[PDB]
Structures are given as C-alpha cells and as structure tokens.
Amino acid sequence: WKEPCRIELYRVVESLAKAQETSGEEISKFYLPNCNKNGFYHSRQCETSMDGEAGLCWCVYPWNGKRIPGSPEIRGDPNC
Numbered sequence: 001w002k003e004p005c006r007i008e009l010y011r012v013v014e015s016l017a018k019a020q021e022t023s024g025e026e027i028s029k030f031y032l033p034n035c036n037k038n039g040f041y042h043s044r045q046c047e048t049s050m051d052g053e054a055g056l057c058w059c060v061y062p063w064n065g066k067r068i069p070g071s072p073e074i075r076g077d078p079n080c
C-alpha cells in the first residue's frame with residue numbers, strides 16, 4: 001500500500017475493538033502502529049500503554065514497519 005501504516009492502524013484498531021467485546025480481561029497495553037503523517041511507520045514503534053507502565057519500543061524500517069534485525073527493544077525510547 002501507499003500508506004501501509006495508516007491502513008494497518010485502521011485495521012488493528014477495528015480488530016482491537018472486536019477483541020475487546022469478548023476479551024476475558026481488560027487489556028491495558030496493546031500495539032497500535034505508530035504512523036507518520038505520510039502514512040508510513042515512524043522508525044520508533046512503541047506499545048501503547050494505559051496502565052502507567054512504559055510500553056516496549058523497538059525500531060523498524062519506515063517503509064514496512066518490520067523490526068530492524070539487531071536493533072534494541074526496551075521500555076523506553078530505543079533511539080532509532
């Protein structure tokens with residue numbers, strides 16, 4: 001797609017909404033694609049947190065949102 005992150009974000013949000021309907025426990029962290037305004041992926045991708053815990057972050061190729069091999073994953077800005 002020309003805006004792969006934007007498209008994925010919409011789909012993930014829809015899927016999350018559906019999952020929450022039947023979810024056996026309230027999920028307070030989840031991954032929403034972190035998109036730039038052009039519809040691609042920010043180099044940094046972070047888990048969304050709603051529980052006062054830092055989300056995991058990792059680094060991705062902006063054109064596909066796939067984790068860069070050998071790049072770090074930490075609960076903080078990995079400095080991608």
Ligand SMILES: [Fe+2]
Nearest residue numbers: 041042043044
């Ligand atoms: Fe970026």
